[PDB]
Structure formats: C-alpha cells, structure tokens
Amino acid sequence: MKSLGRHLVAEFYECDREVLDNVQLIEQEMKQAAYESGATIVTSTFHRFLPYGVSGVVVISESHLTIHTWPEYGYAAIDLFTCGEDVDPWKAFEHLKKALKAKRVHVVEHERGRYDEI
Amino acid sequence: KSLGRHLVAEFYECDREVLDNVQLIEQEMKQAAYESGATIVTSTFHRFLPYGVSGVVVISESHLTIHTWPEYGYAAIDLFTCGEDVDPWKAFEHLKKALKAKRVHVVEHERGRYDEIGIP
Incomplete structure (x- = not known):
C-alpha cells in the first residue's frame, strides 16, 4: 500500500451479449x-x-465498483476501485471475467490518493 | 472515437469542510x-x-462519482460520460471550483474505442 486505494479501469471485449443485456444477472x-x-x-x-x-x-x-455494458458491441466498461489492505480488486476482476465470458481484456491499475501526494 | 470519455481525477488541498458536507457534495x-x-x-x-x-x-x-477524505483534503473524482454532447470537462470545472482544489491530476481515458471494439 502506497495509496488510499487501488483502481482497476477495465475494458472487456467479446463478452456474452445475452449476459451483458441481463440486468438481474449483471x-x-x-x-x-x-x-x-x-x-x-x-x-x-x-x-x-x-x-x-x-x-x-x-x-x-x-x-x-461499476459496470456499463454495450450488448450490441460485446463490450463492457468496468471499474473496480477498492480501499484497504483487506480488499483485492483483482478478485472482482476475475469473477467478472468469468461471469461475462470476455475473450479479450485490457486493465490498467491506478493508485488513488498516493501517500506521497496527500 | 470511443463510446465514452472518462476523467480519473485526483483533487488535492480542497476545502475540508466542503469535503465533509454530504448535502453540499x-x-x-x-x-x-x-x-x-x-x-x-x-x-x-x-x-x-x-x-x-x-x-x-x-x-x-x-x-459521475466522488469519494472524499476530509482529513487529507483529498477527493477521488471520476467523470465518465458518453456521447458527443456531454462534456465531462464542464463537470470537472464545476467541481474544481466548488471544492476549492489547489492542485489536480487528471487522466482521460477513452472507454470503448471504436478501433478496439471494431466499429467504423
């Protein structure tokens, strides 16, 4: 921990489009x-x-944690912003990867509130 | 050239009373x-x-999201908008003013780039 939080900005491509359009399942x-x-x-x-x-x-x-889906393009915009040593946003990533059946992902991990800045 | 535009913003040295005022936020x-x-x-x-x-x-x-840390004068702001007549920088400007941030760091992501998804 070098910051208040960890934030994954994820692009999920070629997902299951039925899942992307299922508000209850999502x-x-x-x-x-x-x-x-x-x-x-x-x-x-x-x-x-x-x-x-x-x-x-x-x-x-x-x-x-946020998700915005575009079923027509197979695409989801996912954000996983967690705080605290106890909480691991990559575990959320993995679950969603498997739940959405994305065939291609891009993820950047940002620090939010770096200790040396605040 | 993307489905949305997303500002990932660090606001520093904000007005700490504002940061702790839920009604005003x-x-x-x-x-x-x-x-x-x-x-x-x-x-x-x-x-x-x-x-x-x-x-x-x-x-x-x-x-649009905000999470504040009054004890540090810091706020984590995310401004994710879609479509061409919504401008997340106008949200930024308002909040910069309202929170009295003295220093900011902002990353602008393209969410859903057309070339990545396969859209002409």
Whole structure:
C-alpha cells in the first residue's frame, strides 16, 4: 500500500451479449464480485438502458465498483476501485471475467490518493 | 472515437469542510452533471463513520462519482460520460471550483474505442 486505494479501469471485449443485456444477472454477478474482493457493500443500483445495455454501481466502504455494458458491441466498461489492505480488486476482476465470458481484456491499475501526494 | 470519455481525477488541498458536507457534495455533484449536459438516472450520497462522503450520480449509460477524505483534503473524482454532447470537462470545472482544489491530476481515458471494439 502506497495509496488510499487501488483502481482497476477495465475494458472487456467479446463478452456474452445475452449476459451483458441481463440486468438481474449483471447485478447478481457484481455483488458476488464485491464479495470475492472482501469488500462491504453499502448500496447498489442497476438500470436497463434502452434498447439494450445495463449500467450499475456498487458503493463500497469508501469507493465503488461499476459496470456499463454495450450488448450490441460485446463490450463492457468496468471499474473496480477498492480501499484497504483487506480488499483485492483483482478478485472482482476475475469473477467478472468469468461471469461475462470476455475473450479479450485490457486493465490498467491506478493508485488513488498516493501517500506521497496527500 | 470511443463510446465514452472518462476523467480519473485526483483533487488535492480542497476545502475540508466542503469535503465533509454530504448535502453540499450532493448539490455540487448534481450541478456538475447539469453543467456537463448529462441526464441523471439516479443519485446516492453517503456520509459514514467519523467523516468522509461517497457519492454517485448515475447518468444515462455511465457515472459521475466522488469519494472524499476530509482529513487529507483529498477527493477521488471520476467523470465518465458518453456521447458527443456531454462534456465531462464542464463537470470537472464545476467541481474544481466548488471544492476549492489547489492542485489536480487528471487522466482521460477513452472507454470503448471504436478501433478496439471494431466499429467504423
């Protein structure tokens, strides 16, 4: 730990498009992702974009997990921002990779609140 | 050339009383969404311990978020917008002003690049 939090900005490509358009399943998988990471969920809110697409946010202790899907393109924008030694955003990543069946992913890990800056 | 634009922002040396004011953070975040041109879907703001605010404004197909650390004068801000007439930099400007940040660091990501997804 050299920062308040760790933030994964993930591009998920060639996903299962049925899953990407399933608002209930996406919400379920996001909550399980949060459980896998060690995080505690404060609130969650998921919405059906029309005609296709799911958007959701899981608020955790001091930060968030988010997903925005484009079923028509097989694409999801995922963000996994966790704080604390106890919580591992890569565990959420792995769950979602498997839940969405992405064939290609790109992930960047940012530090949020570096100790040497704050 | 992408489905969305996403600003990952570090705000430093902010007004610490603002950072711990959940009502004001909600107002300013909603104002920031308005400035950007985004449509609000839902908004949820939390203040929980002994300080610190978390807020999310869910917009059409993406989000604006803030998580504050009053004890450090720091806020973690994310401004993810989609579509050509929504401008996340207008949200940035509003929040920079509202929070009285003296120093900022911002990464702008292209989320869903057309060349990566395979869109002409």
